Design an enzyme around this catalytic site. Structure first.
Site, PDB file in Angstrom:
ATOM      1  CB  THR A  70      17.880 -24.125  -9.494  1.00 19.69           C
ATOM      2  OG1 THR A  70      18.440 -24.340 -10.795  1.00 19.69           O
ATOM      3  CG2 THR A  70      16.400 -23.891  -9.643  1.00 19.69           C
ATOM      4  CB  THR A  71      16.859 -19.773  -5.759  1.00 20.32           C
ATOM      5  OG1 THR A  71      15.890 -19.257  -4.839  1.00 20.32           O
ATOM      6  CG2 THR A  71      17.457 -18.656  -6.608  1.00 20.32           C
TER       7      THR A  71
END
Ligand SMILES: *[B]([O])([O])[C]([C][C]([C])[C])[N]C(=O)[C]([C]C1=[C][C]=[C][C]=[C]1)[N]C(=O)C1=[C]N=[C][C]=N1
Lengths: 229, 230
Positions: free
Chosen positions: A1-2
């Site tokens: 996740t970014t």
């Protein structure tokens, strides 16, 4: 996740990937980590997929019950103190990194980064997730504050694309949305039209010369691609 | 008969007498006045001292609820201190949970629901108190009055107490659109010295308080030398 959120003059630009992955397998490659709280206040969403989903729809019901009783608009600082209250009194039981960004007519565009520890910090830009550690040295060099709305969209799409190129946890689509005085405009660009990828990066075209031919000299002449030559 | 002994008894025509009997506790109380002056709200009340030896500052009916709002009560003093200590709790909740100052129309709607909730149950009696919420929040200067029935209403000016009918006509001569907070402390205090008689009590003084832009949006009492002498 970014996940990340960047402020411009009008409002904010939320940006996130789309992948929930159980350790090493992609359970979902079209996740939506941009969660609607009210019409102009969203939150980015990292960490546990269940622990942050239960917080995001518990805050969004306190926040809509507040808006009806008030009869006016909800400030972003109001929504960021409902995540801080819940991420602090559950901080040993959940895994939750939340970036709250939105728009209100009083303060304009606001960005609040709420880490796993449960603190609240008001920022100009925020970073979050496991892929965020690639983007500190990318924003130290390539980010100049005071961009327009059209420049912050193309920057945050170029920012996420450098993050999930190196990160194994992150990948998939790039979901962005802008929150300002106009209607909220969302945009989802795919992987095959992403602004960056290492497979078409022209400096990773030459293979690293590992598999040397059996030769008479120490002169390195590239890999061995055939059994004859 | 037994149709006016508690609060959970409607009359033969749909009236609740213990609420209406509590409204006679405000009508037999000291005179209250207020004014909205297009950058703030001024509130003045008359303290009826029953002895010469009371300290100056005793029985102040004006209390600060938040930094920008404060409730002055008209009626019974100890019953109104349960309203003040509740509306402070309503204003502490918005600062601690929602990170925002409480709005003027929202603080008054929380007062009118605390005063109404004691008019529907048999074990409780209504307040002998009319609370005047004077606020200056991000919705501008607000002036509300909550009666013992739990009815709230936004006003431009209000007279409450015994001589609330004579002091209401004295408020109709003011402007409230060109009216400022600078002149209205001298005007509203001069209402109380003309509407009230000295042939019943010997000790009476006035207590004025405002919240406006000159006081940095803070609900404060007066400096003692701004009030007219008599
Ligand atoms: B992102 O990868 O951190 C994502 C954010 C989520 C809020 C949409 N989390 C997940 O992908 C998690 C695993 C994880 C990876 C890295 C750090 C923390 C957590 N996915 C799940 O929780 C999951 C796993 N299997 C089924 C359903 N959900």
């Amino acid at each position: 996740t970014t996940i990340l959120a960047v402020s411009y003059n009008g409002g904010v630009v939320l940006a996130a990937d789309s992948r929930t992955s159980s350790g090493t397998y992609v359970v979902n490659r079209a996740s939506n980590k941009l969660t609607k709280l009210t019409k102009k206040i969203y939150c980015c969403r990292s960490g546990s997929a269940a622990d942050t989903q239960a917080l995001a729809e518990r805050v969004s019901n306190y926040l809509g019950s507040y808006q009806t009783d008030i009869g006016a608009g909800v400030n972003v600082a109001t929504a960021a103190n409902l995540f801080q209250k819940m991420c602090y009194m559950n901080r040993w039981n959940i895994s939750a990194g939340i970036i709250v960004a939105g728009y209100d007519p009083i303060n304009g565009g606001s960005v609040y980064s709420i880490p796993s520890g449960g603190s609240c910090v008001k920022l100009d830009y925020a970073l979050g997730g496991s892929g965020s550690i690639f983007l500190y040295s990318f924003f130290d060099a390539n980010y100049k504050p005071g961009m327009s709305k059209s420049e912050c969209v193309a920057f945050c799409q170029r920012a996420v694309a450098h993050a999930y190129s190196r990160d194994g946890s992150s990948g998939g689509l790039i979901r962005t949305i802008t929150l300002d005085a106009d209607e909220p405009e969302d945009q989802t660009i795919p992987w095959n039209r992403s602004p960056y990828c290492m497979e078409k990066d022209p400096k990773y075209v030459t293979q690293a010369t590992q598999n040397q031919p059996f030769s008479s000299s120490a002169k390195i002449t590239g890999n061995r691609m055939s059994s004859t030559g | 008969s037994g149709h006016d002994q508690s609060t959970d008894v409607f009359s033969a025509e749909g009236r609740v007498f213990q609420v209406e009997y509590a409204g006679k506790a405000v009508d037999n109380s000291s005179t209250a006045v207020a004014a909205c002056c297009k950058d703030g709200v001024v509130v003045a009340v008359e303290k009826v001292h029953t002895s010469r030896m009371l300290e100056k500052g005793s029985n102040n009916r004006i209390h600060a609820v938040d930094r920008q709002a404060g409730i002055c009560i008209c009626g019974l003093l100890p019953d109104g201190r349960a309203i003040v200590s509740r509306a402070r709790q309503e204003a502490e909740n918005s600062r601690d949970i929602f990170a925002t100052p409480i709005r003027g129309s929202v603080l008054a709607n929380r007062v009118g629901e605390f005063m109404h909730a004691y008019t529907t149950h048999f074990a409780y009696r209504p307040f002998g108190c009319s609370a005047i919420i004077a606020s200056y929040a991000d919705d501008g200067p607000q002036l509300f009055v909550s009666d013992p029935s739990g009815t709230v209403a936004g006003y431009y000016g209000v007279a409450l107490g015994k001589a609330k009918t004579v002091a209401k006509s004295e408020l109709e001569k003011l402007d409230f659109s060109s009216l400022t907070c600078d002149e209205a402390v001298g005007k509203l205090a001069s209402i109380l010295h003309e509407v009230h008689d000295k042939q019943k009590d010997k000790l009476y003084e006035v207590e004025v308080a405002w919240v406006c832009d000159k006081s940095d949006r803070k609900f404060v009492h007066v400096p003692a030398d701004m009030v007219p002498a008599e």
